[PDB]
Amino acid sequence: SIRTVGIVGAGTMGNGIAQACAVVGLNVVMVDISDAAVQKGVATVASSLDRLIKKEKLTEADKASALARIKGSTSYDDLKATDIVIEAATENYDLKVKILKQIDGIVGENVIIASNTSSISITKLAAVTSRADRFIGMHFFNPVPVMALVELIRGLQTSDTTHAAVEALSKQLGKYPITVKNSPGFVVNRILCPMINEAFCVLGEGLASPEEIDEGMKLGCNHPIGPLALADMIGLDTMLAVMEVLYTEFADPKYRPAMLMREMVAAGYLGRKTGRGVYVYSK
Amino acid sequence: SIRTVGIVGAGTMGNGIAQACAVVGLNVVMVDISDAAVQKGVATVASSLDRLIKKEKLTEADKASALARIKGSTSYDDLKATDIVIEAATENYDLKVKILKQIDGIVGENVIIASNTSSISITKLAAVTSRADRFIGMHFFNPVPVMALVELIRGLQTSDTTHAAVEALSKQLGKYPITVKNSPGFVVNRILCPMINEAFCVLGEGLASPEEIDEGMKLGCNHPIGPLALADMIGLDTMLAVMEVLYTEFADPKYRPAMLMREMVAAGYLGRKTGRGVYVYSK
């Protein structure tokens, strides 16, 4: 079975995943390079759980219960106590690799190594481990506890068995699994992000004003938020790189980045995070 | 001012627009080729208004009041009594033209002719009338009373004056105007529909299952409906033609139709309307 889940990385996703298991009563070994890192991982899940109890989401006891369920370490040997390990610590490739080799170094031959990512080739990663068939990809979503889905991304090597394990693991977390053959942008970003790009093109060609562009899509297609606004929250540098990945991996100008998107990024106009992207923001 | 609005076409859009004016207390001359056509136009606005009163949307008196406000004729000379005329009767080009020439034939030099369309070049249309600057494009949305927006599409010729008139006319209908330089797919379809296409590509490459593809987008990006399902409601033949328009008008393979979308259409699998598109449906 799987009752104990390794996590490498105690940043946003890390605890994100940690929490999500814990409340389901799952044992989590959560590693990260400092004791500063690990415990701050706990602070956000603490702070986060506080909020939930404060809108009657059960309870003070289910809280304590979960927290207990979570063994946060700096020894990566603690991942021997684990059924499966989710690297959730970086999107640098070189670094990502090292970690998975390291992880592959500790755990047993029949322990599954998954890696969370938006962009990186699961198949390229899987092949650095010693048992690829036990390697699978996941893509959790940005507020990881409340968001009820994950992309399950099969490397060319991932086994049927590794898949179902990880598939059911997710159902048990209350997320909807989405199985996807490894491919640039998988499913969600693959169709969402080029749509966002098209918006920049429309704006770029001065066909309409941004606000109006967002209005058109909110009201016309009943999307909760318009793509330009949406882009400002994601980060245009992030948007640009996604598209750069699609063009580069597919080798197809169909996915050309929008030039205005290039210009805004070159200028440092990156969205909410720089205070300026498509719109301008308080701070 | 504008207190009397011509409408050519008493089909779905036609009354759609008719109604929308009427409830705002606006005088509507609604023409169509038979008395069968005109009155059936009234039946749907009748039936439709019934429903509204039946969920406390005011009232039996505001109803009667509106209906009165609506003078439905078969004489296209009745469009002399009108401030502006909205052709809303076909998406055939040859036929569309004739109508606007005919309309242009009746009304005065300072009366505005607008044409509702999703696909047709406003600038190409405008140039068949005798005063292009008085010609403008509109794109109302499929349930035309409740949907609170319109794309206002300027031909290269549309005047600033024609624009503001028609802009304010819309605000008065309680729709949000969206100003758009004439261009293939304008704003809404231009970015929405290629997104839908990308979905067919993903499905086409067997990366994921349709249901899962729809799930991914519903949950991941909080869209009310997934694009494949969405495509089944629009009609794949309609989707295909939109994309055919983008590729053909832009002259750019970036907008290549999705091959699976071509195959489904060639097969007659067109969606809800044929009972089979991406999914299969009751009847």
Tally of CA atoms within 13 A in the half-sphere of B276 that contains its CB: 7
Q: Distance between CA B186 and CA A185 in Å, rounded?
A: 27
Question: Is B25 found in the same domain as B72?
Answer: yes
Rounded Cα distance between B143 and B152, Å, is 17
Question: How many domains would you assign to chain B?
Answer: 2
| C-alpha distance from A167 to closest chain B C-alpha (Å) | 13
Q: A102: closest CA among A118, A117, A85, A82? A: A85
Residues B120 and B253 reside in one and the same domain: no
Nearest-10 Cα torsion for B11, B14, B17, B18: -100
Element (H, E) at A115: strand A112-116
Query: What is the spatial distance between Cα A161 and Cα A170, in angstroms, rounded to a whole number?
Result: 14
| Boundary of a domain, candidates B188, B212, B235 | B188
Domain co-membership, B43 together with B119: yes
- Cα angle value B245/B212/A129 (rounded, 5°): 110
Residue with tokens 């059911």: A168
Name every chain A residue with its beta carbon within 8 A of the beta carbon of B225: 222
Minimal-distance CA residue of chain A relative to B141: A220
- Collapse the DSSP code of A222 into the 3-class scheme (helix H, G, I; strand E, B; otherwise coil) and give the result: coil
Pair A149, A178: CB distance under 8 Å: yes
The set of residues, in sequence order, having a beta carbon less than 8 Å from that of B125 and lying 6+ positions away, is B96, B97, B100, B115, B117, B135, B137, B155
The three-class DSSP label of residue B228 is helix
| Residue B233 φ/ψ, nearest 5 degrees | -80, -40
Cα separation, B35 vs A158, whole angstroms: 67
- The DSSP symbol for B175 reads P
Domain assignment present for residue A45? The answer is yes
Do residues B108 and B130 make contact, with C-beta atoms less than 8 angstroms apart?
no
Query: Residue A130 class from Cβ within 10 Å (0-12 exposed, 13-18 middle, 19+ buried)?
Result: exposed
Cβ separation B176–A254 shorter than 8 A: no
Indicate whether B107 and B138 sit together in one domain: yes
Tokens for B17? Answer: 């627009």
- B283 is a domain residue: no
DSSP B104-165: HHHS-TTSEEEEE-SSS-HHHHHTTSS-GGGEEEEEE-SSTTT--EEEEEE-SS--HHHHHH
Contacting residues of B for A221, CB less than 8 Å apart: 188, 192, 223
- Residue for token digits 């008008």? B249
Name the E strands within B3-143. 4-8, 27-31, 70-71, 84-87, 112-116, 135-140
Helix %, strand %, coil % for chain A, to 5? 50, 15, 35
B255 burial level (CB within 10 Å; 0-12, 13-18, 19+)? buried
Length of chain A: 283
| CATH code, domain with A91 | 3.40.50.720
Q: Check: CB of residue B246 under 8 Å from CB of residue B255.
A: yes
Answer yes or no: do B142 and B232 share one domain: no
Q: Residue A139 domain-assigned?
A: yes
Cα–Cα dist A4/A246, whole Å = 36
> Chain B within 8 Å of A247 (Cβ-Cβ)?
no
Q: C-alpha angle with apex A21: A18 to A23, nearest 5 degrees?
A: 105
Query: Helix (H, G, I), strand (E, B), or coil: what is residue B81?
Result: helix
Picking from B157, B24, B140, the residue whose alpha carbon sits closest to that of residue B86 is B140
> Residues A211, A145: one domain?
no
Termini Cα distance of chain B? 48
In a domain, B282, yes or no: no
Query: A161 and A201 share a domain?
Result: no
Nearest to A11 by CA among A66, A115, A89: A89
Asked whether residue A282 is domain-assigned, the answer is: no
A186 close to B (CB below 8 A): yes
Which residues lie closer than 8 Å to A211 by C-beta, 6 or more apart?
A: none
Strand partners, A276: A271, A280
In units of Å, what resolution does this entry have? 2.6
Containing A106, the helix (H) or strand (E) segment is helix A93-106
The total of other beta-carbon atoms located within 10 Å of residue B111's CB is 19
* Residue B39, both tokens: 């009155």
Task: Say if CB B278 and CB B264 are below 8 A apart.
Answer: yes
Burial classification of residue A99, based on how many CB atoms lie within 10 Å of its CB (0-12 exposed, 13-18 middle, 19 or more buried) = buried
- Domain limit, last residue, from B173, B188, B203: B188
Q: Among candidates A177, A220, A271, which has minimal Cα distance to B195?
A: A220
Task: Please say if B65 is a catalytic residue.
Answer: no
Residue A197 maps to which CATH number? 1.10.1040.10
Among residues A27, A115, A116, A118, which one is catalytic?
A118
Q: What is the C-alpha end-to-end distance of chain A, expressed in Å?
A: 48
Q: Are strands B4-8 and B27-31 parallel, antiparallel or unpaired?
A: parallel
> Diameter of chain B by CA atoms?
58
Domain containing A69 equals 1-188
Question: A129 and A29 in one domain?
Answer: yes
Establish if A49 belongs to a structural domain: yes
Same domain? For B7 and B139 the reply is yes
Which one of the listed residues B151, B170, B182, B197 is annotated catalytic?
B151
Q: Enumerate the known binding-site residues of A for NAD(+).
A: 9-14, 32, 91, 96, 118, 142, 273
Decide the pairing of beta strands B149-154 and B135-140.
antiparallel
Q: Which two tokens stand for residue B239?
A: 């989707």
DSSP state of B259: H
Amino acid (1-letter code) at residue A71 = K
Sheet with strand A70-71: strands edge to edge = A70-71, A27-31, A4-8, A84-87, A112-116, A135-140, A149-154, A176-181
Breaks (C-N over 2.5 A) in chain A follow: none
Q: How many other C-beta atoms are found inside a 10 Å radius of the C-beta of residue A251?
A: 8
Quick check: B100 and B130 in contact, CB under 8 A? no
Answer whether B194's CB lies under 8 Å from A197's CB. no
Which among A151, A170, A182, A197 is annotated as catalytic? A151
CA atoms lying within 13 Å on the CB side of residue A252? 12
| Three-state SS annotation for A72-105 | CCCCHHHHHHCCEEEECCCCCHHHHHHHHHHHHH
Give the span between the Cα atoms of A105 and A111, in whole angstroms. Answer: 11
What single letter denotes the amino acid at residue B250? Answer: F
CA-closest candidate to residue A21, choices A180, A139, A175: A175
Distance between B194 CA and the closest CA of chain A, angstroms:
7
Q: Is residue A219 a part of any domain in this protein?
A: yes
- A140 and A217 in a single domain? The answer is no
Cα(B259)–Cα(A197) distance, integer angstroms: 22
Cβ-nearest to B191 among A149, A181, A198: A198
Distances (CA, A) of A100 to A128, A248, B31, B235: 8, 25, 71, 46
Can you give A170-188 as a three-state secondary structure string?
HHHCCCEEEEEECCCCCCH
* Cα of B82 vs its chain's centroid, Å: 21
Angle between helices B236-250 and B227-234 (to 10 degrees): 100
Q: Does the N-terminal peptide bond of residue A59 adopt cis geometry, omega within 30 degrees of 0? A: yes
Q: Name chain A contacts of B179, Cβ cutoff 8 Å.
A: 208-209, 212
Q: What is the largest CA-CA distance in chain A?
A: 58
Cα A184 to Cα A246: distance, rounded to the nearest angstrom: 6
Residues A89 and A222 in one domain: no
What Rg value do the Cα atoms of chain B yield, rounded? 20
Q: Which long-range contacts (CB under 8 A, 24 or more apart) does B56-64 make?
A: B62/B23
Number of Cα atoms under 13 Å in the Cβ half of residue A90: 11
How determined?
Answer: X-ray
CB-side neighbour CA atoms (13 Å) of A110 = 4
| CA A100 to the chain's CA centroid | 17
CB contact A67 to B (< 8 Å): no
B269: tokens are 């699998």
Q: Which helix (H) or strand (E) holds A139?
A: strand A135-140
B 196-235 residues with CB below 8 A of A?
Answer: 198-199, 202, 205-209, 212-213, 215-217, 219-225, 227
List Cβ neighbours of A40 (8 Å cut-off, separation of 6 or more): A10
For strands A135-140 and B135-140, give the pairing: unpaired
Is residue A226 within 8 Å of A217, Cβ to Cβ? yes
Alpha-carbon gap, residue B274 to B283, rounded angstroms: 9
Q: Which of A155, A171, A188 is the last residue of a domain?
A: A188
CB contact under 8 A, A208 and B181: yes
- Do B16 and B144 reside in the same domain of the chain? yes
Q: Does residue B48 have a known ligand-binding role?
A: yes
Tokens of A69: 């369920």
Torsion, CA B239, CA B242, CA B246, CA B249, rounded to 10: 150
| Known catalytic membership, residue B73 | no
Question: Could you tell me which of A10, A89, A86, A79 has the C-alpha nearest to residue A43?
Answer: A10
Look at residue A283 and tell me if it is in a domain: no
How many whole angstroms separate alpha carbon B139 and alpha carbon B150?
Answer: 5
DSSP annotation of B79: G
